[PDB]
Amino acid sequence: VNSFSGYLKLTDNVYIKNADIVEEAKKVKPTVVVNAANVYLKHGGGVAGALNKATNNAMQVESDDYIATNGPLKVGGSCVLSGHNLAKHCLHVVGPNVNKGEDIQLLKSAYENFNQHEVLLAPLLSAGIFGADPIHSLRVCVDTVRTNVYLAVFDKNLYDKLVSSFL
Numbered sequence: 075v076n077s078f079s080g081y082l083k084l085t086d087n088v089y090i091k092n093a094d095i096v097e098e099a100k101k102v103k104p105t106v107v108v109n110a111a112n113v114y115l116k117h118g119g120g121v122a123g124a125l126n127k128a129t130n131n132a133m134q135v136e137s138d139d140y141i142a143t144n145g146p147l148k149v150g151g152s153c154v155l156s157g158h159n160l161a162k163h164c165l166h167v168v169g170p171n172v173n174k175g176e177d178i179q180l181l182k183s184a185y186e187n188f189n190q191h192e193v194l195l196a197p198l199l200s201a202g203i204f205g206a207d208p209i210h211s212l213r214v215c216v217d218t219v220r221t222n223v224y225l226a227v228f229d230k231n232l233y234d235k236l237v238s239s240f241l
């Protein structure tokens with residue numbers, strides 16, 4: 075039993091809710107919140123921009139030190155950093171950005187990072203400003219993640235379509 079509330083159950087381990095991931099994380103304080111990161115951990119917009127703003131830019135400061143030490147992530151890769159005031163940990167995961175021409179096949183590799191964590195609060199990878207089809211992202215999530223994932227979908231209209239079209 076966990077403290078996630080109000081989700082629809084899609085499978086044994088995948089759940090979904092119309093919610094602002096920032097407001098969700100502040101309420102639940104999950105062990106792991108997933109950020110929709112880029113390889114430079116530059117959290118300018120989208121989910122990343124919103125999560126960073128909620129940390130008062132502390133996420134960005136920590137991320138800049140991480141990059142200065144380690145260099146960029148790989149597309150499909152991840153790193154674990156602090157969750158600041160939102161969660162214990164933030165798993166920064168880089169899905170392919172279609173608007174940069176990145177290979178959508180890497181979306182499965184991106185979701186594989188979730189399997190290293192027993193429970194996660196997460197957005198749909200490569201959705202929104204990363205330009206992939208969110209129905210596809212949900213399919214890849216369900217077919218790749220085996221740990222317990224609670225998906226927050228900000229847009230109510232998109233949330234309704236994801237449920238009604240789910241196979």
Ligand SMILES: O[C@@]1(CNc2ncnc3[nH]ccc23)CCCSC1
Binds near residue numbers: 096120197226
């Ligand atoms: O959910 C999205 C990604 N974007 C966000 N998700 C959750 N919380 C958020 N807060 C700010 C942005 C944001 C992908 C599925 C279709 S709708 C957009």
Ligand SMILES: [Cl-]
Binds near residue numbers: 202
């Ligand atoms: Cl977005």
